[PDB]
Amino acid sequence: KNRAARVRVAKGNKPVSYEEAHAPHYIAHRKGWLSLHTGNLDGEDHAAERTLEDVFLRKFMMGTFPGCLADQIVLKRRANQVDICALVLRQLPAHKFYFLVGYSETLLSHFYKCPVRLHLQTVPSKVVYKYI
């Protein structure tokens, strides 16, 4: 049996998001890609360096916004600009988000030497695609 990235069935009480519900074979069919860069296109270089930055950028955002992430973040690279689009729960006060945005942007712009912007869409609570 295949165990890869499959949220298995319980007794109908496990909420799962759209991203979690779909197994790997639905990638490019029902669900898209969380990161969009040009490094895996044919005749393009620096796939390894873009992929390592993604791993870190995801671990950074989880720790910097602990318990405030409704879904996995979406990374969008255009030219040298990096754009982070994160669904965040409305747990923290509003002013705290302004602090963490200023901090996380400046810190990641001086770490990778690129302009990095954070885009936050706040949800009242996690969106449930289906109960499995």
Partner: protein, 325 residues
């Protein structure tokens, strides 16, 4: 111990609001695309959403959509009883009020025809509606046994003398079979600078592709890639494959063909030319002959192509030796 989200049944006020938001959506989408709201249509909407939200997901159900609420929201079956609680339909307690209400009518029709007392093929090339289509008409779910019984009752109605009312009735449950035109698409007949008539058609066998240019008048001179056919095809079986189209129609030595085949091997290239010549020669033969070609295999593309190899297997079907135990 059931704790899952219940069906979010859509009330009429809900769908009514979903139609006001959609109507305001169209006016905004029109203003974005610079079009006139009055004439903006469903077709323009689908094109606009595809431009503004490019998605390359293979399944099109998973792509962005701004459709009318009627298309997306399933028709809610209306309440079957009123405020006092009395069901609206006398067959409510059967559990299949619409299936049995229809079977009640057809059984009553049969009785009047049998009591009251020509060719029955008033409609031809038609089929009985499939179970899925019937379910939609009744707005309920049926079993296979329910479908089988409904058809038998409808057949009995046709057997009996039928007035025009019955013919219209049974018509509702007969779907016009869109029998496809399994006939050749004859090519046009162009004219060269010399003024001679000629037709062209493509052919594909395995990975080979050919583009023949048959001429209406000729002495049987076939040139493949600017070479003769005896030179290009040193094997007899490959030449016989080029002979099959003309020999069949007794048209040997009456046409001049110019071929251009690229790709594949010797046998795959002869086969591709055979199909290309058969399809080009259609314009210079009678329709009865074209059917004679189609029914002899000359006009069908061969779908047999090399099958991908499988991981964990020696070949497409060949397996690794099951090791001795």
């Amino acid at each position: 111990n059931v704790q899952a989200s219940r069906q979010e049944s859509y009330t009429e006020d809900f769908i009514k609001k979903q139609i006001e938001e959609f109507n305001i959506g169209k006016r905004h989408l029109a203003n974005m695309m610079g079009e006139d709201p009055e004439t903006f249509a469903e077709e323009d909407i689908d094109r606009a959403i595809a431009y503004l939200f490019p998605s390359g997901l293979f399944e099109k159900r998973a792509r962005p959509m701004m459709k009318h609420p009627e298309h997306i929201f399933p028709k809610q079956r209306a309440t079957q009883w009123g405020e006092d609680g009395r069901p609206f339909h006398f067959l409510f307690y059967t559990g299949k009020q619409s299936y049995y209400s229809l079977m009640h009518d057809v059984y009553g029709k049969v009785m009047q025809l049998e009591k009251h007392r020509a060719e029955s093929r008033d409609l031809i090339g038609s089929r009985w509606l499939i179970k899925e289509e019937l379910e939609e008409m009744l707005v309920e779910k049926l079993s296979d046994e329910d479908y089988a019984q409904f058809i038998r009752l409808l057949e009995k109605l046709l057997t009996l003398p039928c007035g025009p009312a019955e013919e219209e009735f049974v018509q509702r449950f007969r779907r016009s079979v869109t029998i496809q035109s399994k006939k050749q698409l004859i090519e046009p007949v162009q004219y060269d600078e010399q003024g001679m008539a000629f037709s062209t058609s493509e052919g594909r066998r395995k990975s080979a592709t050919a583009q023949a240019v048959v001429y209406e008048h000729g002495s049987g001179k076939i040139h493949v890639n600017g070479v003769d056919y005896l030179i290009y095809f040193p094997i007899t079986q490959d030449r016989e494959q080029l002979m099959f189209p003309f020999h069949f129609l007794d048209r040997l030595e009456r046409h001049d063909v110019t071929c251009t085949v690229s790709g594949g091997g010797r046998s795959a290239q002869a086969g591709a030319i055979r199909l290309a010549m058969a399809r080009a020669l259609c314009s210079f033969v009678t329709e009865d002959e074209v059917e004679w070609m189609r029914q002899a295999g000359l006009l069908t593309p061969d779908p047999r192509i090399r099958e991908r190899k499988k991981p964990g297997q020696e070949g497409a079907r060949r397996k690794f030796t099951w090791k001795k135990r």
